Amino acid sequence: ARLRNLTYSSPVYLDMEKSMFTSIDGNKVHIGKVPIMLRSKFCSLRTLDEVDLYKMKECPYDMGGYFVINGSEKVLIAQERSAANIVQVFKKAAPSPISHVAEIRSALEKGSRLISTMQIKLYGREDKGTGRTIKATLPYVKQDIPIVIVFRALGVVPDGEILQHICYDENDWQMLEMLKPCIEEGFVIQDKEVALDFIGRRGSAALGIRREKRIQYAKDILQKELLPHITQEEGFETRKTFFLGYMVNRLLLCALERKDQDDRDHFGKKRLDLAGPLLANLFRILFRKLTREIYRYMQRCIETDRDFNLNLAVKSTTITSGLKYSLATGNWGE
């Protein structure tokens, strides 16, 4: 591969099965080649042993960890990012009506992939900002929604239950005094249904969906998309409501100068993406592209009403060229 400027890569085959529901009222298909990291478990060099390493012109001091793409040895650089699924509280600059913000990036456990990001902002500066209330940010909603409103839209409506999820100390009068503006700014929303509708009326979607579904659209933005690392099945809003209160609690501990703001550079709050996660994020993008090419091919080849041979609807160049391109140029994407 080095000598002849070839790519050292393994063919990947995937079983595919067709089915045709009809109501009057395949096998080992090749999807692309994946470049193999030398001396890994999937490299033809992992066995052999010094005798045959020398016969393969391989140096026993070469420990691998790199790929061969068009003859060139490419190494992946560990990519540093912030940890997912952790709450961090930061302070905001002076010329802003917001003074403290809590943030969390939600990411699933399987695959490990980002999903969405959410914020809870405390408005009102120091003796500036009038009403000092607290609004949240929801995925796919155009405007910040006061905290009390989203608590009610989740099934906890009386003031006393909402505050029992946030403040865990009936004696803490400083924190309770700081929650005052949030209650009064969410006074007119006195039940779950008008809460869910208050949300749905800003979350993009279509114009003119009546209360009967624009609620049911907001019920989706809460079940999925909102803190999806907690759960995405229905009827588990008890886990999400308690977490929302935890965030607000953490937000206020810092605003009361009882706790320092989080240190974005603390290495324990950081993660390094190596070959696996880096390849997986790219393979996900490219396999969806292959997926869309399969769907687009059925709509032309099925208008003929001819049994499609599948292997004629999978161009393995989509995955093979995508992976080759990113490893060859260093541009990690399409």
Partner: protein, 64 residues
């Protein structure tokens, strides 16, 4: 002070788009939708948090 706002909503009757005007009187908690074309009017209660999309939503449910 009253708020006179133009919107990009479609009138439910005459179907002219970008011709619904919303007048929100918060001092008396009374919101008013008006059509700049066919001239109809719809009234509904508003709170302090409401916006032209809140009463236009109430107008869709008042018809159906």
């Amino acid at each position: 002070i009253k708020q006179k706002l133009e919107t990009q909503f479609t009138c439910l009757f005459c179907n002219h788009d970008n011709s619904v005007v919303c007048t929100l009187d918060k001092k008396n908690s009374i919101g008013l939708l008006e059509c700049k074309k066919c001239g109809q009017r719809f009234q509904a209660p508003i709170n302090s948090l409401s916006q032209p999309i809140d009463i236009y939503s109430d107008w869709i449910d008042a018809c159906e």
